[PDB]
Design a binder for these strands. Sequence first.
RNA 1: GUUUAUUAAAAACACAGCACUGUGCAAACACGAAAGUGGACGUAUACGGUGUGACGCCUGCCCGGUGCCGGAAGGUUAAU
RNA 2: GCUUGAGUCUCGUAGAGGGGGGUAGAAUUCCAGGUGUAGCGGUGAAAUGCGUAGAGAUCUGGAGGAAUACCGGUGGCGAAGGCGGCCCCCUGGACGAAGACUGACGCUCAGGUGCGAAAGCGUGGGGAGCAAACAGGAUUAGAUACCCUGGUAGUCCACGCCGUAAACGAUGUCGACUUGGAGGUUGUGCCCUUGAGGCGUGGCUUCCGGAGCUAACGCGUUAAGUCGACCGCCUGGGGAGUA
Lengths: 51, 55, 271, 117, 100, 88
Amino acid sequence: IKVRENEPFDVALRRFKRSCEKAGVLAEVRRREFYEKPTTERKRAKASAVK
Amino acid sequence: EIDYKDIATLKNYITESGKIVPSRITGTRAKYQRQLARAIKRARYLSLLPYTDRH
Amino acid sequence: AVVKCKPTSPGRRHVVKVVNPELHKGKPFAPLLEKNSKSGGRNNNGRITTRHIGGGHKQAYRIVDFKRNKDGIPAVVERLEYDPNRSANIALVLYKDGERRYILAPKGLKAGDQIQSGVDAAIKPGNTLPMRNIPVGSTVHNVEMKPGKGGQLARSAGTYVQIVARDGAYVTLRLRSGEMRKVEADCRATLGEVGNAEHMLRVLGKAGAARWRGVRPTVRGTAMNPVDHPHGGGEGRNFGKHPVTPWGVQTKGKKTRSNKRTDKFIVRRRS
Amino acid sequence: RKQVSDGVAHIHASFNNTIVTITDRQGNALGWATAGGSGFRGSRKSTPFAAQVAAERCADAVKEYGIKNLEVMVKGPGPGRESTIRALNAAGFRITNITDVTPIPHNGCRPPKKRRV
Amino acid sequence: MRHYEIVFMVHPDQSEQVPGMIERYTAAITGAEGKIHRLEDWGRRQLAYPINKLHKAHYVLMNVEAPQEVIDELETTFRFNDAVIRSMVMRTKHAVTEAS
Amino acid sequence: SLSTEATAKIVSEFGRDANDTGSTEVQVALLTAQINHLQGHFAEHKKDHHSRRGLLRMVSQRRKLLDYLKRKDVARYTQLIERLGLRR
RNA sequence: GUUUAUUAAAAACACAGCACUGUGCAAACACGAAAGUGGACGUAUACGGUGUGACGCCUGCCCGGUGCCGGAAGGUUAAU
RNA sequence: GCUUGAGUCUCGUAGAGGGGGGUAGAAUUCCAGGUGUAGCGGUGAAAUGCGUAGAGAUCUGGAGGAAUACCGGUGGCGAAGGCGGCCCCCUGGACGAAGACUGACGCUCAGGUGCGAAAGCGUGGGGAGCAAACAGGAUUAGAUACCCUGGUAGUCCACGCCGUAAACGAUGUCGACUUGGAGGUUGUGCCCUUGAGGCGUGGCUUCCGGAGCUAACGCGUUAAGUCGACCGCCUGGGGAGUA
């Protein structure tokens, strides 16, 4: 979660949060408890991941 | 993997923010991913490892 | 155990009893009994001061130990008994030096059960000890308000008081009312909650049951003439007035606490 | 006044508004500025521009403290946050840490239903 | 008589009462003719997260074979004792003796 | 299920010898032992509807074997249910 | 069940049950120039007041008026 | 009588199978307090709502309830409904390896009995979040809706009831035979284990396809192919799964 750097620093370059929290994990927990849509969203996500 | 007190090994199999790493990344056949995770959780109860990095 | 009576003869149709097989079927312990003469609701002037009281069954008073002074001596619960003067049951207990006393019976307490009053008592239900030694967030009954005086809070059946704070020489207590009250922390209190909760589930069923607990009928105000009650009169049913006591003071809302002496000790009124 | 010389910039980016609070290391606030309090009410208070002018305006109003070092703590998602920390090192601050402190439940409370728009 | 692995943290300020406790606990095991296989005192070790805040605490690893009743009263001993925070007793995984 | 020492004891009591562990009296007695032990378990719990399904498999299977042994040798049947205290 | 002893026994009163409201104990409340007493040797699962009146299905909308509860900013406001 | 069906015993394996008890960490809400100050929240835009009685933000302490991120996977277990932190206790089943034992003890099953999501009902608790009803704000021609702000039953626990679902692989159960390929998961045997290998042999499962079948679509060794046993059900649409 943290970053620090010594005096050679210019830019933020914190892409630790395109790794874990920001993009998916908080936008996922904005909306409803189903049990049902996730079983089919994961079903078609794993059925789309195919050659 | 079988053991939870070896937190060097467990600390390899965990990310920088306390989260268990998927076997999609680290190899780790599923039996040992299950033993692994369960050992990580037993270690987080004992405060050998952290649950997160914002305690 | 609550029991609906079978509806033979109306009068029994709606009765729910609270039976208790663990109460002592027999005579109470005699040298802790005394005469309790019934008053009728009438003061030393003869006048009815509290209305609706009178008749009912003859009752003998049972000296219940509210103080719990025998400190450090253990006591085994000899039995549980029916007390007519209270909602709760009383436990007759026997100290190790051969002295029997009646206490209010807490919830889990059966016959053959160790209780122990005093500072170094174990924290388990039935043990009276000062509230600077009880943990915060514990259900506690038979609470003293002044040290040494006797228990006055949470005595009625199924009733507890939760200790929520220990700020200094005082403990903040959530009374069963919902009211937060400060009590001095040297005041003893008995652990657990007092134990006949199912008392509130009984339904009495007929008019004579109320009569035999000593509760005479209540004539309602609007049924009277105007000379009697402020509600009075009127050619069929006629209310038209703001509801009052028989002495003209507003019922239905109007707050009647005036103390100013114990307002220091009230952290929050009930709601 | 009181001359703290190190603080924390808690930026609270949400979807509708970013709110920047500059405090000390004890956690006592020294001065705040929101994107909605900088003009542009409404669809324009959730933009990176509004967040950066919110952060410029929060860099002002802590001149009375002589803050030179600060950590940055970032909550929530939002069109803000990224631009926000930029505005902070456009205001002479030595930005030391950038932590992201978004609250994530470990499957706690049930989130609200919504949005059949 | 099955196997158990007991660990328990102790409050750091009562660390000097640690080996005494150990003896008593081990004594309780020998009250039931159960045997104790390893025993480790791991020292005051830094906690990964604060608990009542209280950082660095004193760990004791035990690994006892016993009947389940003395293990149960050992658990209640860990309940009431204010010294010990976080016990954990586990599975058989038949008797171990090694280090980590 | 049942202890190894318990199963060995019942095989030793009901079989022709040890290693005769599949005879009809032996299977019936092992099922009986487990049925009674789980009477103790299901007096408590009472909402372990999954474990009970295993128990009713034991009851039904015991019943099938008693029906077999009844229509093969009735003397073994009467000695068996006499010894196990079943049939009520 | 009770009631107009002596023209009214009833659909009226009562009632169990329900609800609202007051009451933290030196309780509210009542009798009492006061002391005191009843409430109660009870303690909110208790006690007082008010309405409705077993049980079953239910109890909709209105807070502008009158009351009550709460608020404290401003206006007005006694003795001094 | 016999062992190739069915079952018992020995040793292990994997598992969110069940029931009871305990505990842990994040987060939401509330309460008390510190800093601090003019907005916060919300939306397509707004307003209702909260806020100088000091909100929102932020830090500290506390209470409480529910759910258990990451692992997590057309992964696993269960007859089905379903089951997801960690630990203990009680307990069911499955599968594998070699050997021993019983000896057809088997398959299906009308009536019968049991289990059976969710909502609902009864009694007693609990009540943080979410949220039918409800209220207000908008939107609109209207808006008893979608959207916003609140919000009660309910959701949670104990015991009892109900007895249903697109309770669905829209595919009854049991058994036998019939070309293949790529995986997943869990056992086991053999070989320089010369490593994250090579060769087999089981259990469960996913995708694609051959013959065959099928109205077609598709199914395709887990069949909707080729057969056998027993059960359940169908007979034009509506009326009506109603009286």
